[PDB]
Design a protein around this nucleic acid. Structure first.
Lengths: 216, 54
DNA sequence: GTGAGGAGTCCATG
């Protein structure tokens, strides 16, 4: 956050996370708000921070508030959200206002584009994901079936020797916790591919316009 | 509804109406019942002689 | 202490 605020010519920043920062974490929210206020006072800017960005908040209030506050008053916006939250809501764009913007609005398309002028994110924070092993929340047998299916698929493809697979199955049958399962999973080569896929999907979904800044 | 070829509309109005009458949409059971109005349910109940049952 | 470190959803049945 401090590194972003140090940058003079920027307006937007969306820091993807893996936990929801709501009133349940009001203490850390207040700590972050106080730090942001102090850092804004250090420079000469006015910054507005949005908290509690969830699916329920999106369906109750709407995403148009950020767009309304972006093209009406000069300032900078910081948004906190998680990976799974941005799975059902698409097109996070906003109308532009060339009077407030500077001169770093270089068009990218080689041909003329019709309709209005719109932009997208120019700064994104990425975080290492968490548990990537599937689970079920319908009954007690379904979860065990899912775990056994994952173990057998990993053994079949070739990422686990028979010894490791048999030991993992025996431990899972006689009672086990999530931490041991994740520890066993993290030592294969599928974990890196999953993390890379998630990072690629996250970075791809940001950027749908042709009004790109000088620096991203 | 909107499509042009060489700056000229491709389909007429009747052809557009025929084209738009070939696509269906199937939601869950709960929403389908709520989409129906009172007249449709009343007509169906009268037609099949289901109004007798209490 | 020893591992790791959480939100999100579709549909059927009295």
């Amino acid at each position: 956050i401090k590194a972003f605020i140090s940058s003079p010519d920027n307006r937007y920043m969306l820091s993807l996370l893996n936990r929801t920062l709501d009133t349940t974490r009001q203490n850390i929210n207040d700590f972050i708000q106080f730090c942001c206020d102090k850092w804004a006072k250090e420079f000469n800017v006015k910054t507005k921070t949005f908290f509690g960005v969830n699916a329920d908040w999106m369906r109750l209030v709407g995403y148009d508030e950020i767009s309304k506050h972006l093209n009406t008053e000069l300032g900078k916006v910081v948004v906190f959200s998680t990976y799974a939250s941005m799975g059902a809501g698409k097109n996070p764009d906003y109308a532009v206002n060339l009077a407030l913007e500077g001169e770093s609005l270089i068009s990218v398309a080689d041909v003329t584009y019709s309709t209005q002028l719109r932009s997208d994110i120019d700064s994104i924070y990425l975080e290492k994901p968490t548990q990537l092993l599937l689970s079920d929340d319908y009954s007690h047998t379904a979860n065990q079936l899912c775990q056994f299916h994952q173990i057998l698929s990993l053994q079949e493809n070739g990422e686990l020797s028979p010894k490791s697979a048999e030991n993992w199955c025996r431990q899972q049958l006689m009672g086990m916790s999530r931490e041991r399962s994740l520890q066993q999973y993290h030592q294969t080569s599928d974990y890196q591919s999953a993390v890379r896929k998630y990072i690629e999907q996250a970075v791809g979904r940001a950027g749908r316009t042709s009004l790109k800044r000088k620096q991203i | 509804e909107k499509q042009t070829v060489k700056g000229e509309p491709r389909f007429t109005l009747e052809q557009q109406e025929y084209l738009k009458a070939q696509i269906v949409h199937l939601p869950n059971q709960s929403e389908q019942l709520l989409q129906c109005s009172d007249a449709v349910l009343n007509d169906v109940l009268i037609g099949f002689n289901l109004n007798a049952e209490r």
